[PDB]
Amino acid sequence: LEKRMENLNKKVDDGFLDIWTYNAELLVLLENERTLDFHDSNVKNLYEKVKN
Amino acid sequence: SHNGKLCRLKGKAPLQLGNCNIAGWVLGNPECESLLSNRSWSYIAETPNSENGTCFPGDFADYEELREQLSSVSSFERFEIFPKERSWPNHTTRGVTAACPHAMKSSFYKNLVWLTEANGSYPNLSRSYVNNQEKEVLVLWGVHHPSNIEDQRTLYRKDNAYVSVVSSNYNRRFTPEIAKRPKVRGQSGRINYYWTLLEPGDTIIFEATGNLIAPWYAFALSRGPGSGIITSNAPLDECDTKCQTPQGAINSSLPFQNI
Amino acid sequence: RKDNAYVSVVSSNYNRRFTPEIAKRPKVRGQSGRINYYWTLLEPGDTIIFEA
Ligand SMILES: *[C@@H]1O[C@H](CO)[C@@H](O[C@@H]2O[C@H](CO)[C@@H](O[C@@H]3O[C@H](CO[C@H]4O[C@H](CO[C@H]5O[C@H](CO)[C@@H](O)[C@H](O)[C@@H]5O)[C@@H](O)[C@H](O)[C@@H]4O)[C@@H](O)[C@H](O[C@H]4O[C@H](CO)[C@@H](O)[C@H](O)[C@@H]4O)[C@@H]3O)[C@H](O)[C@H]2NC(C)=O)[C@H](O)[C@H]1NC(C)=O
Ligand SMILES: *[C@@H]1O[C@H](CO)[C@@H](O[C@@H]2O[C@H](CO)[C@@H](O)[C@H](O)[C@H]2NC(C)=O)[C@H](O)[C@H]1NC(C)=O
Numbered sequence: 289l290e291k292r293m294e295n296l297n298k299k300v301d302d303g304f305l306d307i308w309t310y311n312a313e314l315l316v317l318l319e320n321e322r323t324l325d326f327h328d329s330n331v332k333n334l335y336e337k338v339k340n
Numbered sequence: 341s342h343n344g345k346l347c348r349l350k351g352k353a354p355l356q357l358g359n360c361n362i363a364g365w366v367l368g369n370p371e372c373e374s375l376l377s378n379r380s381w382s383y384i385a386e387t388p389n390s391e392n393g394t395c396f397p398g399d400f401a402d403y404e405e406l407r408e409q410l411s412s413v414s415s416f417e418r419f420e421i422f423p424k425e426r427s428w429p430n431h432t433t434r435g436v437t438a439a440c441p442h443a444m445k446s447s448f449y450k451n452l453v454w455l456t457e458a459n460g461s462y463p464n465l466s467r468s469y470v471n472n473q474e475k476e477v478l479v480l481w482g483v484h485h486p487s488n489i490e491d492q493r494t495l496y497r498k499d500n501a502y503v504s505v506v507s508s509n510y511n512r513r514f515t516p517e518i519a520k521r522p523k524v525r526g527q528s529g530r531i532n533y534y535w536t537l538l539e540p541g542d543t544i545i546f547e548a549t550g551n552l553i554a555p556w557y558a559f560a561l562s563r564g565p566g567s568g569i570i571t572s573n574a575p576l577d578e579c580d581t582k583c584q585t586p587q588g589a590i591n592s593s594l595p596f597q598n599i
Numbered sequence: 600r601k602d603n604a605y606v607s608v609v610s611s612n613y614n615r616r617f618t619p620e621i622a623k624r625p626k627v628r629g630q631s632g633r634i635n636y637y638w639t640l641l642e643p644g645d646t647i648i649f650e651a
């Protein structure tokens with residue numbers, strides 16, 4: 289006789305974990321792109337330093 | 341953008357309550373007589389303000405838990421748990437009230453039986469039902485709380501009566517409480533409605549010496565993966581969408597909505 | 600040895616009256632009778648009173 293509580297606790301536990309899963313995955317892919325562009329900029333600024 | 345109209349889901353018509361509540365559907369309200377047939381649905385469509393619920397006044401115990409249990413129910417089989425003629429040889433089952441008028445005459449619930457006296461005596465009651473439907477069975481009853489001791493002695497022939505309803509997972513004893521009450525729908529008495537969900541292979545036992553509104557028809561409930569209760573004022577037409585809101589239906593593959 | 604019995608369990612934060620309910624019941628583990636189990640958590644320096 290506490291099904292509204294069981295569904296609410298299930299909603300909280302399956303909403304927080306989905307939000308933090310999305311946050312971790314989104315942070316991983318965004319800083320993967322930032323790393324892959326950061327390395328290209330470090331090679332290009334080295335080439336520009338030797339050119340200058 | 342939506343249709344603006346209520347739709348069937350995947351070729352399955354919704355259970356439209358119309359003027360009914362969840363309570364008036366399960367109790368078998370005489371205005372809610374179209375819903376009392378063996379059927380399946382995709383969702384339950386209900387009006388935001390519907391008045392045909394419990395016609396006799398009283399407290400529906402754990403109504404919102406019954407709504408949460410019935411949100412995941414896809415179909416029922418309405419079967420006579422206790423027959424009105426066979427199971428009651430020593431009580432007068434022909435009990436109607438003025439709180440539930442059906443075509444301008446007095447009637448009572450189509451799922452419940454108001455037991456009264458027979459030949460000036462109310463005998464002891466012990467009726468057992470064993471679940472052989474292999475599903476969850478919604479058992480529904482009521483306990484009558486009169487307004488004065490004169491109506492209690494008139495109806496049930498004793499001052500002190502009780503109702504005992506014991507399952508394996510249910511154990512509750514009920515005591516009528518005679519008191520002076522405000523009139524709701526012309527009645528100063530109350531029928532308090534209770535419910536339990538029988539397990540497959542479980543036994544319900546109904547014991548009473550008075551004030552029992554016994555079960556007549558029970559609901560053998562079938563669960564489903566996708567179902568719910570939608571509160572909408574939208575009219576239902578012929579429609580075969582896959583997404584359904586209260587405000588209409590959606591036919592697109594777009595990932596988001598703001599309806 | 601009596602028709603009407605009671606159990607009264609009173610603490611500072613607990614107050615409940617228990618009445619036995621004799622009824623015809625389904626048999627679970629070979630018994631038609633029930634023992635209803637209750638519990639409470641005493642505070643430090645608190646008094647529990649059992650009356651029956
Ligand atoms: C303050 O409140 C308290 C409680 O809240 C009040 O206490 C109550 O007072 C009333 C009124 O006096 C009492 O009712 C009486 O009960 C008597 C004993 O009952 C026994 O006999 C019954 C006989 O049954 C038959 O008669 C009744 C009508 O009386 C019919 O309904 C029935 O169908 C039968 O035909 C048994 O049924 C019962 O089980 C008991 O064994 C009655 O004898 C008494 O009847 C007298 O009065 C009638 C008119 O009302 C008259 O017709 C009769 O002939 C007879 O003279 C009456 O019903 C409550 O019992 C009592 N309750 C408690 C718990 O004590 C209190 O009065 C109130 N005080 C004030 C100042 O308001
Ligand atoms: C609605 O469903 C119930 C099932 O619970 C039907 O009751 C069965 O009816 C058949 C006869 O067609 C009997 O053989 C079964 O024993 C009944 N089962 C019970 C009472 O549990 C009921 O007839 C259906 N009503 C309809 C189709 O109008």
Ligand SMILES: *[C@@H]1O[C@H](CO)[C@@H](O)[C@H](O)[C@H]1NC(C)=O
Binds near residue numbers: 441
């Ligand atoms: C159903 O609702 C209508 C309108 O609110 C009302 O007039 C009627 O008495 C109701 N019927 C029952 C049985 O409650």
